[model samples]
Target: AQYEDGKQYTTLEKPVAGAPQVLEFFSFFCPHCYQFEEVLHISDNVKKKLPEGVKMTKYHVNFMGGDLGKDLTQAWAVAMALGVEDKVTVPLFEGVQKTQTIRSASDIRDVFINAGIKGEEYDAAWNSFVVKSLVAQQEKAAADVQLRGVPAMFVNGKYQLNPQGMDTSNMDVFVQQYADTVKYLSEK
Candidate 1:
């Protein structure tokens, strides 16, 4: 099912599913995606309303593909592979968009280090086959979906929403749009 406010969302082919996945394609370097993080945070009241068993996943997309984006994409992949994405995600986002500290791979590593990840652990994860493979998987998945922008949203593997057609300037409306869409899809 698509979100039909007549203007906000359109359906892709009905998604096939055993369980629904709320996938978000984002880059730490994407300002809008950074701003949109509030909705993704687990503790957010809006995010808390998501139906039980709806799994949310984030894939870093290199929509702009600046060196920074690619580097950070790798960083994100490693963080996930090491099971520290929940700890590093927000700091990396702020490091790039707010404090403007994350400029290269080294800077990203520093952020993880500051988050209590040991240097050896970080290095292993960054160079691990699992991390590399997952990064490639993320790249391929984004392409398979023909993603047009950062912060793209999909429910159960079918493309559902992008920021383009929605009024995202207001966080309340933005958050509600996601909550409503996910609720509808999870029940299907």
Candidate 2:
């Protein structure tokens, strides 16, 4: 069924079950996504509240950053596969949005280098089957959602967390509420 984000918790043909997979689509080049850049990314913080089984899948959408969009998406998949998201996220985001230093995929590689991922390691992850699958999965999800914005979450695999009625003031409190909503929504 097409999810309507009913009260921020909608539907997704509902079947494949175990635990809710909170899939969040974001772009490093998105300024809005940049707002959450900080110690313990908003996703990390939010994940802390989720139950053990709920998986938080961070998917990078390749629709922003123009020419660099797809490249950055590749970089993100590698980061996630290598378990370096905590170390690489902010630098990549800051590089793309704040400092404007990442002009090419090579520059993105340098950012990963700065994060302690050796060139070989990055290449290994880049070429890994898992990373490649993640990139493909992320791209498909973006198309599946017909996503129009960054930092959007699809809880339980397809329920788009309704952006309406969410309070943005005080990032901490708002994020906490978001996780809470995700937790409760999964039950329904």
Candidate 3:
């Protein structure tokens, strides 16, 4: 039932190296992605229920262009570089998707500031070479996958989880199936 092609998941032409690699490709501005967090509880469930030894890396999708998307992607890369992603990830989504408070780089800066990031640290990471490179890398990676939407999951580098057709009413079961699939791939 898992990785059955066109059903549960599809195989990657070249699987990502790190075994059990779990990556969630998402966008803070995406409504469905917000629901994936607020309603379906995908990220929260994955954090809690993912099997031992499986660590998830979240990649902010650059599918959305223009100033808002660029700023958010840069902000996400900076957060990741500063190691504050865990603290700021949800707040970012909440700010942008929920309260509509974050729409520019200035707004993003304030969010980090409110979250306790020093001005200097935030500025440095935001303008750092590594952050720029990471933003470009993430964009390229998303393009490589021909990613069409958010709340997508990849297990062990294999593009495996698609949020479409998921039963939103019984999200617990959906989350469990996601975890089970990851576990199966990890052990393979």
Candidate 4:
């Protein structure tokens, strides 16, 4: 299903299975995406108090590194396939951002290890069933869309939120606009 967002996104078609949903499309490499990271972290508290329809899904866009994106894409795909995306996704982001490291192989593995994923386990999990499929999806997004920058978000495909353009420096407007749009459309 299509919403007001310019780019056609894969639709949820229905309300997310559980409550307080907040699905955001983002990329780890995007500076803007990183900027919004803090707000997203804080939003968790709001989400906890929200009604049943409020939750959040941060869909990582991997269009940054053409080839390395492919590799990272595979890693994410593996995490999803094993139904452990929730387990690894956030930690992965934090790993890349918090550490002063280069966000490379050893760095990633270190983060995974810190997240409690064993080296052997990560290797095996990286090659799991859905990893390849998710990687293909990431490639499709890169080739199919015009991703000038990151921290761009899609709200149920009903709208696309461009926080980078919205705020010159303050990232506060990102979540505010997201909340405003969601409330406006939902009420309509």
In order, what lDDT does every prediction score?
Answer: 0.73, 0.76, 0.77, 0.53
The regions of model 1 sitting more than 4 angstroms off are 1-6, 13-20, 38-47, 162-170
Question: Model 1, poorest ten-residue lDDT window?
Answer: 38-47
**To one decimal, what is the Cα RMSD in angstroms of model 3 from the true structure?**
2.4
**Candidate 3 residue-wise lDDT at 162:** 50
lDDT of 2 by residue, 63-173 (tens): 787889989999989988889988888888888877999999889999999888989989888888998898987887777766788878776655767656567766677
How well is each residue in 37-59 modelled by candidate 3, as lDDT tens digits? 77777777777766677787778
Give lDDT tens digits, candidate 1, residues 1-188: 25553345555654434423776688887777776774444225335766876666778977664988888888889887888877898898888888998888898999999999999999988888998998997887786666777767666765466446656677677677666766675565
Off by over 4 Å in 3: 1-3, 13-20, 49-51
Off by over 4 Å in 4: 1-23, 39-51, 81-91, 94-100, 137-148, 164-174, 186-188
Every model: Cα RMSD to truth = 3.2, 3.8, 2.4, 6.4
- lDDT, candidate 1, residue 61? 79
Q: What is the TM-score of each candidate against the true structure?
A: 0.83, 0.84, 0.85, 0.63
- lDDT of model 1 at position 18: 41
Cα displacement (angstroms), candidate 2, residue 41, comes to: 4.1
Error of 1 at 86 (Å): 2.2
Candidates ranked, most accurate by TM-score first: 3, 2, 1, 4
lDDT of 1 at 155: 68
Total residue pair clashes for candidate 2: 0
